[PDB]
Design a binder for this molecule. Structure first.
Ligand SMILES: [Ca+2]
Ligand SMILES: [Zn+2]
Ligand SMILES: [Zn+2]
Lengths: 111, 410, 222
DNA sequence: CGGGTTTTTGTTAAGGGCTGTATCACTGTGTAAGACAGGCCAGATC
DNA sequence: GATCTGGCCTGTCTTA
DNA sequence: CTGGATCTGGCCTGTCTTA
DNA sequence: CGGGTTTTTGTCTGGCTTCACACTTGATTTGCATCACTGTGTAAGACAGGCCAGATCCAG
DNA sequence: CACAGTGATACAGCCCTTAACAAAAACCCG
DNA sequence: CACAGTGATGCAAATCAAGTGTGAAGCCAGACAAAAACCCG
């Protein structure tokens, strides 16, 4: 409507937004754990992993009647930390701390 | 149109004790016609008759649809205005030129429950089942093909007059037979019609009943316990979930009804009946029903399905013959309302009006949906202001002037 | 609380081992009301379950249950032994509402009452709260209804129905103690917003427990 | 480093009109089963 | 042959 | 004079119809 | 029913703008089509039938 | 001391006008 | 023959360039017509 009436593009089309979404979603920023995570893959591009986690759905196996979707926990934490970059930077700048410091930050998460 | 809305929660605060219900009232223009030369011609007809974008709201209140006193106390001014406007002409300026308007009112978006409640007739479980003719439930299980529209507003008022005055001084049952089941004074002049949505819902529910009876092979076992019927219904529900990908719902709705009426549905159901003749019976039954449905469900049957329209009487007679012959175990001495209506009143309805599906009450239900949305996200959360806000927002949403600014491509 | 009982390896809430932080029973929690520390870690639940499974002392059902303090499921989630403030407020509001119902009916004077009397008492209370507090009857205890029900004017409106006068002062002191204890477990930082309530919390809690034990025996006896 | 001269920048009062923000009274999300004490009949019994 | 025991039930309270 | 066979009234209760 | 008095405008006229105006062709960006479902239809009333209760009639 | 809304109303705030004065920031010359 | 949406997924159509020299529609100096809508004649 806006494009047809105003004869210009004040807003962007849908595909541009779709392409921009892939930055905020998990599985887009590189990272690595210095102690390797036991029983956890080190790949860093996984998105929405299936919730069933490869549960056996054969007819002989225990029946399955649920569906689920979810992310990788560590990838979710990485994405959440990268979302709050500006806030952490401003907090360090306001508390009389040099921004280039790379001390061992401690994070507390409520489940 | 009009309908009652249940499950409307009440808010905290001050004010009178508001019941947990809601009743709306709306109207919709259909066709504008000018008298040019020596005949008539239409100027603007509604392309989407059942669309929510043309259901203009008029009145809104929070009361029970069975609270007759409050309902009449609210709706009497509107009916008085309608009666006063039914014999006047309007002068209106269009583009700088005065124009002349005259109206023809028609109320069809009323479900049978409200029709019975307003027209002063008896309930749905009455012996006088039809609201158009004067037959009982017994003859409605024998003739099925020969009836005629008789009921009317003025006749209802005269009947009520006779019921109150009792001129002949006769007994209660004789007076009931003389009045044909009228025990209240009508106050809304309506026209005899058939709601398409509720008709389809009732037909689908009755078919579902017929299917779950045919699974148990009741045509040879007249005796059946309680758990047997429940088992049968559970087996039917599981088979439908497995084949038709449908969900067993407790109360019949429209989409389930639409997806149920299909030849391959009966084909899948035939996997449960070991017989062979009953398969032919059910298949011919569904074939007749699907050949008949577009007569009363299409938008304009005179153009979209002339073959079904001209060949309707023979199909209805064969349908009644099939009911009386093979389904004698259930349809001997009792029959639903919509079967009688569909089989004995719709040809006259098309020949008198032209269409039925265009006069349905779908747009009213979409307006109920819009009401449930607006009352929750487009109103001030207070009893004193919520209804005004909802009404104004819905009137703005229905306006076509704002809608014209959306088709900016053509 | 329900999910905590489930995942941590505990029974339902209607049992005798009520608290998920201390391991006291129903009677001992209805007697003391004051002094209770916390000894309930996550590995402790695993040890409890292992004792319950292996039964090294070859005890009976009741003895082993008393030893394990009611553990019959292997834990699988490490949770923090804290308190949910929202459900706590809801439960306190519901309990208070029940106490108002009982106070209206004079249960301490007549320990016997039929169901119909309870129905009429609840209807009278609901109608009074509707005519004097702009509230409506609700099936389950709400959240806003809780916050709005906990006011001095509500106590006044309820006392407008009680014929006695000592009950009035009892309810006044009850609500005053509860309002004095409320801001401790509801603020984002009590040590910097309401330090007086925090410093005076123990005394207020002890007086609250003493009030319940003395002048509310008809309900909280055992 | 000042007069003579110049171009920018307020400043008062009263009224008009467009824009932004506080204020009012409220809501929707915290919603099914299990533990337990007391009463009670069927039945083995000494 | 009454006499407790056992299990069966059943209403109430506790989280939702 | 009494008891004794028996006969509708209405009530309550599933059941069918629309929502 | 038509002689004066003002708007309302293409025109001449050639010499000057900023604009207009032909193949590529590989990506690149829009614009439209396609496909499995959906929510609004959501509590009472009429009626037949079985059942005792107390009334209805019958007997020595 | 959950907290993000939710539409209408009132008022502060911030633009506008005229009207003479009055102060501020620079360059010729002495 | 309810219907106005729900999403992604895919394919089809516009574009868009950076190169390039020519072609074309206004704009101007006055200025007397060429109608054309007013007065009423
Ligand atoms: Ca309805
Ligand atoms: Zn009929
Ligand atoms: Zn504890």
């Amino acid at each position: 409507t806006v494009k047809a009436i105003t004869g210009r593009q004040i807003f962007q089309p849908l595909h541009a937004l779709r392409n921009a979404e892939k930055v905020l979603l998990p599985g887009y920023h590189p990272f690595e754990w210095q102690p390797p995570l036991k029983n956890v893959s080190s790949r860093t591009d996984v998105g929405i992993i299936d919730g069933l986690s490869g549960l056996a759905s054969s007819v002989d196996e225990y029946p399955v009647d649920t569906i689920a979707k979810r992310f990788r926990y560590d990838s979710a934490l990485v994405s959440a930390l990268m979302d709050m970059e500006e806030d952490i930077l401003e907090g360090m700048r306001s508390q009389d701390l040099d921004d280039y410091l790379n001390g061992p930050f401690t994070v507390v998460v409520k489940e | 149109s009009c309908d009652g809305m249940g499950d409307v929660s009440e808010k905290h605060g001050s004010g009178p004790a508001v019941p947990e219900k809601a009743v709306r009232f709306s109207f919709t223009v259909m066709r504008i016609t000018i008298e040019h030369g020596s005949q008539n011609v239409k100027v603007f007809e509604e392309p989407k008759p059942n669309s929510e974008l043309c259901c203009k709201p008029l009145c809104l209140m929070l009361a029970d649809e069975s609270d007759h006193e409050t309902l009449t106390a609210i709706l009497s001014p509107l009916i008085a205005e309608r009666e006063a406007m039914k014999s006047s002409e309007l002068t209106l300026e269009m583009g700088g030129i005065p124009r002349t308007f005259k109206f023809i009112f028609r109320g069809t978006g009323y479900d049978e429950k409200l029709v019975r409640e307003v027209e002063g007739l008896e309930a749905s479980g009455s012996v006088y089942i039809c609201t158009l003719c004067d037959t009982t439930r017994l003859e409605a299980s024998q003739n099925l093909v020969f009836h005629s529209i008789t009921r009317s507003h003025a006749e209802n008022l005269q009947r009520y007059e006779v019921w109150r005055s009792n001129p002949y001084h006769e007994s209660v049952e004789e007076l009931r037979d003389r009045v044909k089941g009228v025990s209240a004074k009508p106050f809304i002049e309506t026209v005899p019609s058939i709601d398409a949505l509720h008709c389809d819902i009732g037909n689908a529910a009755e078919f579902y009943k017929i299917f779950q009876l045919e699974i148990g092979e009741v045509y040879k076992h007249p005796n059946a316990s309680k758990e047997e019927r429940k088992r049968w219904q559970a087996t039917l529900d599981k088979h439908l979930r497995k084949r038709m990908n449908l969900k067993p719902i407790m109360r019949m709705n429209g989409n389930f009804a639409r997806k149920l009426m299909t030849q391959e549905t009966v084909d899948a159901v035939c996997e449960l009946i070991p017989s062979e003749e009953r398969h032919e019976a059910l298949r011919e039954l569904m074939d007749l029903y699907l050949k008949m449905k577009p007569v009363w469900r299409s938008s304009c049957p005179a153009k979209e399905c002339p073959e079904s329209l001209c060949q309707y009487s023979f199909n209805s007679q064969r349908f009644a013959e099939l009911l009386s012959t093979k389904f004698k175990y259930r349809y001997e001495g009792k029959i639903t309302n919509y079967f009688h209506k569909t089989l004995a009143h719709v040809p006259e309805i098309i020949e008198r009006d032209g269409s039925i599906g265009a006069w349905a009450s779908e747009g009213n239900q979409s307006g109920n949906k819009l009401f449930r949305r607006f009352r929750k996200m487009n109103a001030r959360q207070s009893k004193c202001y919520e209804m005004e806000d909802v009404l104004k927002h819905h009137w703005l949403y229905t306006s076509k002037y704002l809608q014209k600014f959306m088709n900016a491509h053509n």
